[PDB]
Amino acid sequence: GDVEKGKKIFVQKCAQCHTVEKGGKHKTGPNLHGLFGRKTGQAPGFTYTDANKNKGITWKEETLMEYLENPKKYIPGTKMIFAGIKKKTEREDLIAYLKKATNE
Amino acid sequence: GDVEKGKKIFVQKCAQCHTVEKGGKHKTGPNLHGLFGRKTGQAPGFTYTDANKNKGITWKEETLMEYLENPKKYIPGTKMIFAGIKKKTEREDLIAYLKKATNE
Numbered sequence A, B: 001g002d003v004e005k006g007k008k009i010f011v012q013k014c015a016q017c018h019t020v021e022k023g024g025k026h027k028t029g030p031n032l033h034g035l036f037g038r039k040t041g042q043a044p045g046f047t048y049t050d051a052n053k054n055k056g057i058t059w060k061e062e063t064l065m066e067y068l069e070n071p072k073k074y075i076p077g078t079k080m081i082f083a084g085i086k087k088k089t090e091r092e093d094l095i096a097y098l099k100k101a102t103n104e
């Protein structure tokens, strides 16, 4: 596989939720440094779904090839994002902006 | 609600998958212009899930307040993102980059 091309894919498709650097922060998704040879659900400090915690496989080329084809088929129950807004005041402010912008 | 604050929320939490401008493109999510007073699942040209197509409610302040609190509770079956990589060669290139970056 080509590292240059895979870097570009990573930046375009993965970096919004994941870092890969050593010492890198958790974002929407876990930091992935040391993933290879690690079991699912093991980045220290990250709260996974029970599905991702329990899948029990070891990450490596072959299992990433299958997972990446369709994460939710490979780990049914996995959740990639929470798209909502829990705070009442943020919801009200966002709704007021949407009422303006989606009408003008 | 405060339009200024809601604009900032939109940019930080929604704009990665949605546009709101008239004439705006579909991205991961549908363009939202003309949402208010429209039924779910109606942006022209966008392929929704059957869940979002069938929910059958009208979008307005009160229904957005509930949806935004937790989209998947309000529309069980909804899907916000496909995080995978369907092409074999992209997967191989991405895996090769991850093998390098997550180890160095």
Ligand code: HEC
Residues within 6 Å of the ligand: A010, A013, A014, A015, A016, A017, A018, A028, A029, A030, A035, A039, A040, A041, A042, A043, A047, A048, A049, A051, A052, A053, A068, A077, A078, A079, A080, A081, B081, B083, B084, B085, B094
């Ligand atoms: C935000 C919308 C995400 C995008 C885009 C991608 N990933 Fe992700 N990933 C995300 C979360 C929230 C989680 C944990 C899910 C859960 O059910 O707990 C994950 C998980 C992974 C994993 C497994 C990690 C582990 O077991 O420790 C991998 C290997 C992974 N994600 C890789 C990955 C790649 C390479 C992406 C680009 C194609 C990508 N993800 C997108 C959030 C998000």
Ligand code: HEC
Residues within 6 Å of the ligand: A081, A083, A084, A085, A094, B010, B013, B014, B015, B016, B017, B018, B028, B029, B030, B035, B039, B040, B041, B042, B043, B047, B048, B049, B051, B052, B053, B068, B077, B078, B079, B080, B081
């Ligand atoms: C990408 C990860 C998304 C983020 C972040 C947000 N939304 Fe979204 N939204 C997304 C998709 C793919 C879809 C269609 C889902 C389906 O099951 O088909 C939606 C849907 C909506 C809707 C309903 C639109 C309609 O019925 O026509 C609304 C009102 C909506 N999204 C609003 C919205 C807001 C305000 C967000 C910021 C808080 C937001 N979404 C995040 C994808 C994504």
